[PDB]
Short mmCIF file of C-alpha atoms and ligand atoms in Angstrom, two decimals:
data_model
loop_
_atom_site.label_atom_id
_atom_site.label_comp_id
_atom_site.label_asym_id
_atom_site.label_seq_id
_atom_site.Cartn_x
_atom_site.Cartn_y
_atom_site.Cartn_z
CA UNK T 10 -70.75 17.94 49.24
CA UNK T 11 -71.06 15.30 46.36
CA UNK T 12 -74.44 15.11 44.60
CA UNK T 13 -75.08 11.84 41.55
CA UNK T 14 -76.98 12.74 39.06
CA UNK T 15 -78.17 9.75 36.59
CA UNK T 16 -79.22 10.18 33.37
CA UNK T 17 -81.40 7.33 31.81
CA UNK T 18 -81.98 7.54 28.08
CA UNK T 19 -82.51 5.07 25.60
CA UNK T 20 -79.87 5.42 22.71
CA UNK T 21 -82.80 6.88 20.46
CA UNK T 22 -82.86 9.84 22.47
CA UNK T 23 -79.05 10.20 23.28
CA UNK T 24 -78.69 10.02 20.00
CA UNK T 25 -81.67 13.21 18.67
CA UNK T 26 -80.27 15.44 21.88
CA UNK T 27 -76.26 14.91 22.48
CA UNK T 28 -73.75 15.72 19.72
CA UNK T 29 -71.32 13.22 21.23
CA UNK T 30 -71.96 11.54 24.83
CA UNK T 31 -69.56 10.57 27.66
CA UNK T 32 -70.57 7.51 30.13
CA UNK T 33 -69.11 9.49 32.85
CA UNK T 34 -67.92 13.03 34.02
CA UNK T 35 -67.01 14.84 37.01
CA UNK T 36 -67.34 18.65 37.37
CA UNK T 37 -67.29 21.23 40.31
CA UNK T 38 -69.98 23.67 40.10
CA UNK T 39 -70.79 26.56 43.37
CA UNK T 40 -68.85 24.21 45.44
CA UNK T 41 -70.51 21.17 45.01
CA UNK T 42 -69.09 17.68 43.57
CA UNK T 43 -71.56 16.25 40.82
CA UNK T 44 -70.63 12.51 39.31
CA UNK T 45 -72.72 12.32 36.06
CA UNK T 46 -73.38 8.81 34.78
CA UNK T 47 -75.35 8.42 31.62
CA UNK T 48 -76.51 4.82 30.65
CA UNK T 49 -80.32 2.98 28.87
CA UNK T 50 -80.28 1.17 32.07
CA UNK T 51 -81.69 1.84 35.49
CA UNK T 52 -79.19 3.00 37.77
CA UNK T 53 -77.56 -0.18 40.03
CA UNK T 54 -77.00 2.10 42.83
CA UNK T 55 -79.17 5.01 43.96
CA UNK T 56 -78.12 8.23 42.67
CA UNK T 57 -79.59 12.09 43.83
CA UNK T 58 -81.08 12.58 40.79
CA UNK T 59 -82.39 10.57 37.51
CA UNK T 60 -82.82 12.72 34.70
CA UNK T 61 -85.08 10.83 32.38
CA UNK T 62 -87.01 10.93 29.50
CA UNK T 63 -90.29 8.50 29.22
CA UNK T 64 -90.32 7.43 25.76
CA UNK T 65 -93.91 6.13 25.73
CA UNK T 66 -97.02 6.30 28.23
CA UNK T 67 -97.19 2.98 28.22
CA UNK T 68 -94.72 0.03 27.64
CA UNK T 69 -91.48 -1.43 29.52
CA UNK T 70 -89.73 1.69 31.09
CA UNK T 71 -93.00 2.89 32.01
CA UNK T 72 -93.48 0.17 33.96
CA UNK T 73 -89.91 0.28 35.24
CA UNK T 74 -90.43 3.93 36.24
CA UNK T 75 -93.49 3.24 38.34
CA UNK T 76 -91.92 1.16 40.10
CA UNK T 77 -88.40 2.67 40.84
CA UNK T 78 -89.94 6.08 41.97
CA UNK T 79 -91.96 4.13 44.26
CA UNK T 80 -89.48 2.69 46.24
CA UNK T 81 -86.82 5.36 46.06
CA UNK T 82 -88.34 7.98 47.42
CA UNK T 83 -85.85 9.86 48.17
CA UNK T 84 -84.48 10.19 44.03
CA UNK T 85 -85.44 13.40 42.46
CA UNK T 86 -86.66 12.94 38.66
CA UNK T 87 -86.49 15.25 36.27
CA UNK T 88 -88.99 14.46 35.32
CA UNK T 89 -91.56 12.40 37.07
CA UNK T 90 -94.15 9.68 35.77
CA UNK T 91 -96.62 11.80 37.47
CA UNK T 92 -95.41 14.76 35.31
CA UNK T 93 -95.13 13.17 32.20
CA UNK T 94 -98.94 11.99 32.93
CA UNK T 95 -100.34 15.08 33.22
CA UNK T 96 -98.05 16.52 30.14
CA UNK T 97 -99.11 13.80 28.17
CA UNK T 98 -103.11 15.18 28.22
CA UNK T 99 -103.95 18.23 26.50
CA UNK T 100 -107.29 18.56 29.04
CA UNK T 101 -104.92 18.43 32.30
CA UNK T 102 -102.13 20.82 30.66
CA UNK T 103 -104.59 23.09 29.71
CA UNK T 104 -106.32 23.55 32.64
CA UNK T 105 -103.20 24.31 34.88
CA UNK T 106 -102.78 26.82 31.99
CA UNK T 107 -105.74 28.55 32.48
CA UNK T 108 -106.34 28.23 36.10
CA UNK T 109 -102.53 30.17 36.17
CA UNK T 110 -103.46 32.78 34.04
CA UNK T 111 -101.52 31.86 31.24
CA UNK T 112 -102.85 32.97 27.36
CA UNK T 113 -103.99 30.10 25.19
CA UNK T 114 -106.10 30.14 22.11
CA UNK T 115 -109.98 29.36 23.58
CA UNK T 116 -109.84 25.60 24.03
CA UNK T 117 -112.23 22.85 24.95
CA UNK T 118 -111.44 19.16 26.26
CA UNK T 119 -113.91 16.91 24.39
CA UNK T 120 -115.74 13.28 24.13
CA UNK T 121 -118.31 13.85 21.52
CA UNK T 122 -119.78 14.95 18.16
CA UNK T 123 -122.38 16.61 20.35
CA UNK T 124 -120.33 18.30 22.90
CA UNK T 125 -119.15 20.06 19.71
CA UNK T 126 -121.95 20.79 17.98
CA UNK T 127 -123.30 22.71 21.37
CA UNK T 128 -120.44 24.45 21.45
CA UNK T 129 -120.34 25.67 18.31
CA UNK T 130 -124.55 26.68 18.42
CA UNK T 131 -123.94 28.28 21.77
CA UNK T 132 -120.74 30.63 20.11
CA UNK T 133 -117.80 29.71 22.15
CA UNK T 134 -116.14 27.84 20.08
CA UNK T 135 -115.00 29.94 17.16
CA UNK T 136 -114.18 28.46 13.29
CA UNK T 137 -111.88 27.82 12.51
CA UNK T 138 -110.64 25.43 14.96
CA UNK T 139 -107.71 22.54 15.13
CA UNK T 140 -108.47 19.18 16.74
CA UNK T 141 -105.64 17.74 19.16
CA UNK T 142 -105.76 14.62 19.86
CA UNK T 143 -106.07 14.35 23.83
CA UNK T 144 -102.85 12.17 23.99
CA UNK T 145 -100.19 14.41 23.37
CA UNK T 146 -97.18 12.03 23.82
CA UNK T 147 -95.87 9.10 22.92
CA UNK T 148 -97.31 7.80 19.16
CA UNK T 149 -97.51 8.97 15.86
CA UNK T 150 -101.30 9.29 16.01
CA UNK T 151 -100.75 11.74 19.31
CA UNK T 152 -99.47 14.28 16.26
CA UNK T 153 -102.37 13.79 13.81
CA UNK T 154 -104.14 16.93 13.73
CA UNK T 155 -107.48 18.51 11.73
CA UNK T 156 -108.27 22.01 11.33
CA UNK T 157 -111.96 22.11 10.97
CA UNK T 158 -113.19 25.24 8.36
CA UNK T 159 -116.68 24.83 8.46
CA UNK T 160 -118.91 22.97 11.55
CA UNK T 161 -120.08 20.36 8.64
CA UNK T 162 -115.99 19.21 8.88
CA UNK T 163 -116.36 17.85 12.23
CA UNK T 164 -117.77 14.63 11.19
CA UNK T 165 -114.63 12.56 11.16
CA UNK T 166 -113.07 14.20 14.22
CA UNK T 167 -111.45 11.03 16.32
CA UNK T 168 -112.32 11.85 20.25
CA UNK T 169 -111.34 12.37 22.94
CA UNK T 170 -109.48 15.49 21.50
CA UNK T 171 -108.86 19.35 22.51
CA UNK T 172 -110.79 21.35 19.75
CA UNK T 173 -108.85 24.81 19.97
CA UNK T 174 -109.02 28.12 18.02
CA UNK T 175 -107.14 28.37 14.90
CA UNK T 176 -105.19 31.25 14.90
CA UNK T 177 -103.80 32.65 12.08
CA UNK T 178 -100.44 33.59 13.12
CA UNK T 179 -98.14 34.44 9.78
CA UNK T 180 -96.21 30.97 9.78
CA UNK T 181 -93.92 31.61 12.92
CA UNK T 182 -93.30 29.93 16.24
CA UNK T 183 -91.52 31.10 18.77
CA UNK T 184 -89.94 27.93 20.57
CA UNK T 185 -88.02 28.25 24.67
CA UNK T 186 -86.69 25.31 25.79
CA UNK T 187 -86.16 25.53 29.41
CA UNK T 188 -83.38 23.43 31.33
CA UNK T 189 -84.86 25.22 34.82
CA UNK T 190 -84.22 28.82 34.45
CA UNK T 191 -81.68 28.18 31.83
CA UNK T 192 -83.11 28.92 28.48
CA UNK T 193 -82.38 28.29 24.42
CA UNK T 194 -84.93 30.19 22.32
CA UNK T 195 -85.72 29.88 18.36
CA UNK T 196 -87.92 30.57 16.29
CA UNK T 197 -89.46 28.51 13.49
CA UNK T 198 -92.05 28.11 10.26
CA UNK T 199 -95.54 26.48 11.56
CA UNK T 200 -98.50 26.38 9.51
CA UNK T 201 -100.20 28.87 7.16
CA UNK T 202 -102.41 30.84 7.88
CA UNK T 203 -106.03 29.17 6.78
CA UNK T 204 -108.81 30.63 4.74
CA UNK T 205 -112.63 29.56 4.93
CA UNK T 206 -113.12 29.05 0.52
CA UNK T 207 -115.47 26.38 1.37
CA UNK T 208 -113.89 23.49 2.66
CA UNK T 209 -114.90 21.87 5.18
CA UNK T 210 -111.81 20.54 6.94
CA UNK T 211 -107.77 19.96 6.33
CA UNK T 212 -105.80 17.28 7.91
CA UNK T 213 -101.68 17.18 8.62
CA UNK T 214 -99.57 15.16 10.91
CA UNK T 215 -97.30 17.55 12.82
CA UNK T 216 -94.26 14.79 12.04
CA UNK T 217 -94.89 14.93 8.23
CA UNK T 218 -95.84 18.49 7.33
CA UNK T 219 -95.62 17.53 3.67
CA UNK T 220 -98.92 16.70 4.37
CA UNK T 221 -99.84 20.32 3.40
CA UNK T 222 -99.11 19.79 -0.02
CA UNK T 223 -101.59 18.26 -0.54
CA UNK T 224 -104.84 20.61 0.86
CA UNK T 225 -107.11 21.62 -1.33
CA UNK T 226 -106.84 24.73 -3.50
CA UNK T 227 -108.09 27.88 -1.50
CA UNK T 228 -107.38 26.92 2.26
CA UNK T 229 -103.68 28.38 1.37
CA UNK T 230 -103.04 31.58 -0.49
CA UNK T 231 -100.94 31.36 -3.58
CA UNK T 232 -97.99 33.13 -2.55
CA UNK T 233 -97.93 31.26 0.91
CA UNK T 234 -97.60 27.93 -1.16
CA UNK T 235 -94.99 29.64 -3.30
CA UNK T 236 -92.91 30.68 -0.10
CA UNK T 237 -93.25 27.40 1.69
CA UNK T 238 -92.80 24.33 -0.91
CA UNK T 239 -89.31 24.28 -2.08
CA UNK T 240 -89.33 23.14 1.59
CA UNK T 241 -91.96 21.02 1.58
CA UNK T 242 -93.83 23.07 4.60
CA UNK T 243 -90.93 21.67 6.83
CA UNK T 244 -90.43 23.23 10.57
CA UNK T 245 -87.27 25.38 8.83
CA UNK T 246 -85.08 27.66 11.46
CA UNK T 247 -86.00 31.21 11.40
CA UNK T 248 -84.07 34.45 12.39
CA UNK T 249 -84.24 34.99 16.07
CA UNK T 250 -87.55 35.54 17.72
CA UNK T 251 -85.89 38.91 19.11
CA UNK T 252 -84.36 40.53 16.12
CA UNK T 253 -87.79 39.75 14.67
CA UNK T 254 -89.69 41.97 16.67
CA UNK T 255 -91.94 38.92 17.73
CA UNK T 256 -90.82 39.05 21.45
CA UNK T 257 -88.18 39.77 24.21
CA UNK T 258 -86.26 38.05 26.05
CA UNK T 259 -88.07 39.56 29.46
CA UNK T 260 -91.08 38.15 27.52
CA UNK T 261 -89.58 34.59 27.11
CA UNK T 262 -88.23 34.48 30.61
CA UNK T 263 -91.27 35.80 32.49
CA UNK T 264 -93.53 32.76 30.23
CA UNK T 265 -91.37 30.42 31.06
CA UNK T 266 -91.05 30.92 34.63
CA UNK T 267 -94.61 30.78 34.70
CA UNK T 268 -95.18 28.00 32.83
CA UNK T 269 -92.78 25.43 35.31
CA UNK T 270 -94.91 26.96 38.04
CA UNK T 271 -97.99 25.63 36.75
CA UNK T 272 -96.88 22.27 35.72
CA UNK T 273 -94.22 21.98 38.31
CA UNK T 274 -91.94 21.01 35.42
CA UNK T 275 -88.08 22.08 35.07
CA UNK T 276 -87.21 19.94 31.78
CA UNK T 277 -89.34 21.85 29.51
CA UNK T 278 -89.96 23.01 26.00
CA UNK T 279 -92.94 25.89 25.47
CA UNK T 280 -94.28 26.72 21.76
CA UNK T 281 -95.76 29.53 21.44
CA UNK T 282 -97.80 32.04 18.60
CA UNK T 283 -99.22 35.29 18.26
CA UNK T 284 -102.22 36.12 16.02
CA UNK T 285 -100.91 38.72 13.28
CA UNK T 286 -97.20 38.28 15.01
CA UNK T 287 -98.40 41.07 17.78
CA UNK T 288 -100.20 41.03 21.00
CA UNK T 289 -100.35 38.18 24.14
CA UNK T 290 -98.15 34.74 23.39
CA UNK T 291 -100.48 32.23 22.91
CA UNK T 292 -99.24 28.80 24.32
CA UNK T 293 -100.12 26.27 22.12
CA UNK T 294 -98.04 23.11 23.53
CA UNK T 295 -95.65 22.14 26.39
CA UNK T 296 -93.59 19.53 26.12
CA UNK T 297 -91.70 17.19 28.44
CA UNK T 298 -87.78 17.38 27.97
CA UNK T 299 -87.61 18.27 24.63
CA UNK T 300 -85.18 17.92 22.06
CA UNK T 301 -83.59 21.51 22.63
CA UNK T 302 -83.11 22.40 19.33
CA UNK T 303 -81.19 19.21 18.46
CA UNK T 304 -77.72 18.17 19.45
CA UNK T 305 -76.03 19.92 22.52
CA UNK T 306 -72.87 19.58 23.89
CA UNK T 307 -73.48 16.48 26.64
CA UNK T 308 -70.66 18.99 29.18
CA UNK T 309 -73.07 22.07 28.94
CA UNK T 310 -76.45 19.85 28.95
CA UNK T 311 -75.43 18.03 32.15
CA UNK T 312 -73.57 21.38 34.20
CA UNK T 313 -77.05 22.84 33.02
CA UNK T 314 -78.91 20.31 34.59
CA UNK T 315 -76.56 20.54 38.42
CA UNK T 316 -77.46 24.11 38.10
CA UNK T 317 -81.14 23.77 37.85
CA UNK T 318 -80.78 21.06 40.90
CA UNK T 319 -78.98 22.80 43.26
CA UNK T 320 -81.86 25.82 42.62
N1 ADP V 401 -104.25 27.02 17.99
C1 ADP V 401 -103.43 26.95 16.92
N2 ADP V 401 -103.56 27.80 15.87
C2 ADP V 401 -102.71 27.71 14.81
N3 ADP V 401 -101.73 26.81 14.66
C3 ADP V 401 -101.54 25.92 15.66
C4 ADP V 401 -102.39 25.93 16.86
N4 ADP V 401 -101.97 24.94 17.67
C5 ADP V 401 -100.95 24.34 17.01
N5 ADP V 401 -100.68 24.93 15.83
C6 ADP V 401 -99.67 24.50 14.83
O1 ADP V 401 -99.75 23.07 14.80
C7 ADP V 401 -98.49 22.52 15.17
C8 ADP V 401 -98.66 21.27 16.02
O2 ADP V 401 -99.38 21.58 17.21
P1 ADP V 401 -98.75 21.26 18.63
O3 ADP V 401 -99.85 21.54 19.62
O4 ADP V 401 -97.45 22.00 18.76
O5 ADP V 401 -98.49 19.67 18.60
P2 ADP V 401 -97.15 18.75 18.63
O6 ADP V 401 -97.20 18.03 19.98
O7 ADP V 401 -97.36 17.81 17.46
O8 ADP V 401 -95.94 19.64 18.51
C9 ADP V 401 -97.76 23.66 15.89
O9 ADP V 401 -96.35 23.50 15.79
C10 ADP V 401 -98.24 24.88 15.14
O10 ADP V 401 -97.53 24.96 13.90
MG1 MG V 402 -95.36 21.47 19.34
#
C-alpha cells in the first residue's frame, strides 16, 4: 500500500523545527509506501494525511483550514482546527485534564475580579497564584503572565484568565514532546521559586524571561538571582530529567499516553513540575506540535510521523 502524507508549514516554522528540509522523500516503513511532500501551500491534490501546524487562531490559514477539513473529509490532520481550538483555551484543556485524572496545580477558569475574590474568601484558591491568560496560543499577549503574592495584587489581572497555584518547584521543568508514542524528553530552568516579602504581585512574559530581572527585591532569594542572571533567567538546557532523579522514563511514557487520550492529540508537547522536585507531575501546559526541542532531522521527523499514522 502507498499512503501521502502532506506537511503544510509556513517557512517560519520549517525553519524553528527542521535542521535542513527536503520538498520530497520516499521511504518504506512495516511495508507500507509513504510519499512525503512538504510545502506553505495547501496541498493541490488530496493526500492521506496533512500534518500541520496553525500558526494563529485566527487569520488566513485559519480560514483556509476550516474550510479544507470540511470538504475533505476523508484527510487525517495532525492536528485538527478542532484540536488546536480546544488547545488553544486553558478552561477546555484543563478540564479534559481533570475530568481524566490527570495532576495539575488547583486551577480555576475565570471572568471577573469577583469570581476571584470569592474564591480566595471561600479558601480554594491558594496564594500564591499565576494568572494565564485564557488564550494560550497564537500572540505574544497569550504568554503574558502575573503571579499574584498577596489577594490586594489582583487588581490589574486582564480576564478571562486561568488563576492557578503557584508552585514552588526549584527552577526545573521537565519537558516530553510526543510525536504519537514516540517521545524526546528534556529538562529545563523555569521560574524561581517565589516568596510572599510583601509584594503584592510580579509580572513576566514567558517569551522574554528577562523580565525577571527586574522584580522587586525579596520575591527572589539572593542566591537564586546569583545562579540565574549571567543567563538572564533564560529557559537554559538542563541535565536529563532521569539522571536527575526528577522522573522515569515509565513516568514520562505513562503521562504522556494519558495526556493524547484526553485531548485526542498525537502532535504534542507536555510541561510538567513537581513541588520540591518530588511527588505527582504537575501538568502545567500542553501544547500543539511543538517545537521538539528545536531543529530535527526532517528524515527522522517525517518516518516518526508514518509511524504514529499507521498506529
Ligand atoms: N502553576 C505554576 N507554578 C509555577 N510555575 C509555573 C506554573 N505554571 C507555569 N509556570 C512557569 O511559567 C512558565 C509559563 O507557563 P506555561 O503555562 O508553560 O505557558 P507558555 O504557554 O507560555 O509556555 C512555565 O514554563 C513555568 O516556568
Ligand atoms: Mg509552556
Amino acid at each position: 500500500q502507498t499512503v501521502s502524507l502532506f506537511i503544510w508549514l509556513p517557512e517560519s516554522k520549517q525553519k524553528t523545527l527542521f535542521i535542513s528540509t527536503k520538498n520530497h522523500t520516499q521511504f518504506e516503513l512495516n511495508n507500507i509506501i509513504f510519499d512525503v511532500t512538504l510545502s506553505t501551500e495547501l496541498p493541490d491534490k488530496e493526500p492521506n494525511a496533512i500534518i500541520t501546524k496553525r500558526t494563529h487562531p485566527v487569520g488566513k490559514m485559519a480560514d483556509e483550514m476550516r474550510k479544507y477539513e470540511k470538504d475533505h473529509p476523508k484527510v487525517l490532520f495532525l492536528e485538527s482546527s478542532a484540536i488546536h481550538d480546544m488547545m488553544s483555551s486553558r478552561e477546555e484543556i484543563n478540564a479534559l485534564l481533570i475530568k481524566n485524572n490527570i495532576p495539575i496545580p488547583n486551577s480555576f477558569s475565570v471572568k471577573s475580579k469577583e469570581e476571584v475574590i470569592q474564591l480566595l474568601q471561600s479558601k480554594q484558591l491558594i496564594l500564591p497564584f499565576i494568572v494565564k491568560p485564557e488564550n494560550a496560543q497564537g500572540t505574544f499577549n497569550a504568554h503574558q503572565m502575573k503571579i499574584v503574592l498577596e489577594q490586594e495584587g489582583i487588581d490589574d489581572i486582564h480576564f478571562p484568565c486561568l488563576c492557578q497555584h503557584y508552585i514552588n518547584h526549584n527552577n526545573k521543568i521537565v519537558k516530553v514532546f510526543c510525536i504519537g508514542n514516540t517521545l524526546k524528553w528534556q529538562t529545563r530552568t523555569s521560574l524561581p521559586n517565589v516568596h510572599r516579602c510583601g509584594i503584592k504581585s510580579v509580572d513576566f512574559n514567558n517569551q522574554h524571561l528577562e523580565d525577571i530581572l527586574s522584580w522587586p527585591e525579596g520575591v527572589i532569594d539572593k542566591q537564586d538571582i546569583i545562579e540565574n542572571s549571567a543567563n538572564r533567567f533564560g529557559s537554559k538546557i538542563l541535565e536529563d530529567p532521569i539522571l536527575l532523579n526528577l522522573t522515569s522514563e515509565a513516568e514520562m511514557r505513562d503521562l504522556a499516553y494519558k495526556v493524547r487520550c484526553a485531548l485526542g492529540v498525537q502532535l504534542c508537547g507536555i510541561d510538567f513540575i513537581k513541588e520540591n522536585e518530588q511527588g505527582n507531575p504537575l501538568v502545567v501546559d500542553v501544547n500543539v506540535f511543538p517545537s521538539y526541542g528545536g531543529k530535527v532531522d526532517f528524515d527522522w521527523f517525517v518516518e516518526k510521523v508514518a509511524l504514529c499514522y499507521t498506529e
